[PDB]
Design a protein around this nucleic acid. Structure first.
Ligand SMILES: *C[C@@](*)(O)[C@H](CCCNC(N)=[NH2+])NC(=O)[C@@H]1CCCN1C(=O)[C@H](N)Cc1ccccc1
Ligand SMILES: [Mg+2]
Ligand SMILES: [Mg+2]
Lengths: 258, 30
RNA sequence: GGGAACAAAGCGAAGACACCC
């Protein structure tokens, strides 16, 4: 996350860290949607161009974390995975269209003050909230800048980062890049003339873009950090997988595998 | 959404609000 | 009108606007 701030404890209890067993390393973000299901970006698990193709046994999910590196005993929970499900029409060859994946945990995690599921939006909530100008929130332990010099400062945060960003008009998203923007994506970020800055970055993928409903007070996950060109560049925007557009698939997987 | 999804234990459940959520709420008006 | 359309191909402050009944 670029130009964000340190998250407050318990501020994003649905935040999940995807972690590799060997070598031990942070892979991506993800979100808790129930006691046994986790949502993330498909490219986090499968991306041939980088020889990336993880199976259930290669990783762990760390739930309830604040610090990026410190093991937080009796706070965080480390769960193993029963199975991974990549969206069947995920397009890694072209533009990451349908960059979404589900992971079922081996055993249910107990919720706590630091561990709690986010809601997925229903059709009306999606129609009402996902509108240009309204702001959402993105969180992650990803890079603080698109490029940097480690000899003059660490590239990753010490603790979970957060930033609120406005949803952008679709034609504006399209006009900002040469990559094709599918109907299963949306973009967010400040325009050069708005003053404010902020963006997700490499390492933040799979993390959630959430919105708090003013009508029932609940937080809903509207997007999944997916891709961008550089980070926080002027005239460029972060792109997110449109969760509601692909909710039918999410529901299918879950009703089909409990 | 079902059950108590999206209601944070340390915030909405304790009727407390975080340091920047007002910004999100304000964007619905602005 | 309804289902289906694993939001598939397409079409603006984006809003299901070829299969089945
Ligand atoms: C995997 C995620 O951590 C990462 C998120 C990037 C978010 N950036 C901004 N500015 N919000 N995604 C990626 O790095 C993806 C995976 C494939 C390459 N990629 C990119 O974002 C490229 N920079 C652009 C791109 C290449 C191929 C297909 C789609 C986009
Ligand atoms: Mg920008
Ligand atoms: Mg389509």
């Amino acid at each position: 996350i670029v130009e964000g701030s340190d998250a407050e404890i318990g501020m994003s209890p649905w935040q999940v860290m995807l972690f590799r067993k060997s070598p031990q390393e942070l892979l991506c973000g993800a979100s808790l949607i129930s006691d046994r299901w986790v949502l993330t970006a498909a490219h986090c698990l499968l991306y041939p161009p980088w020889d990336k193709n993880f199976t259930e046994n290669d990783l762990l999910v760390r739930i309830g974390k604040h610090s990026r590196t410190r093991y937080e005993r009796n706070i965080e929970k480390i769960s193993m995975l029963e199975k991974i499900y990549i969206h069947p029409r995920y397009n890694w060859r072209e533009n990451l269209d349908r960059d979404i994946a589900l992971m079922k945990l081996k055993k249910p995690v107990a919720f706590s003050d630091y561990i709690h599921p986010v809601c997925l939006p229903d059709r009306e909530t999606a129609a009402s909230l996902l509108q240009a100008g309204y702001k959402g929130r993105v969180t992650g332990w990803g890079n603080l800048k698109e490029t940097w010099t480690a000899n003059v400062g660490k590239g990753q945060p010490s603790v979970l980062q957060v930033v609120n960003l406005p949803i952008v008009e679709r034609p504006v998203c399209k006009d900002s890049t040469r990559i094709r923007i599918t109907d299963n994506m949306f973009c967010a970020g400040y325009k050069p003339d708005e003053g404010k800055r902020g963006d997700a970055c490499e390492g933040d993928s799979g993390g959630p873009f959430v919105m708090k409903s003013p009508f029932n007070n609940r937080w809903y996950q509207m997007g999944i950090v997916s891709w961008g060109e550089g980070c926080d560049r002027d005239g460029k925007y972060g792109f997110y997988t449109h969760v509601f557009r692909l909710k039918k698939w999410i529901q299918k997987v879950i009703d089909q595998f409990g | 959404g079902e059950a108590d999804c999206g209601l944070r234990p340390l915030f909405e459940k304790k009727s407390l609000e975080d340091k920047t959520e007002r910004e999100l709420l304000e964007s619905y008006i602005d």
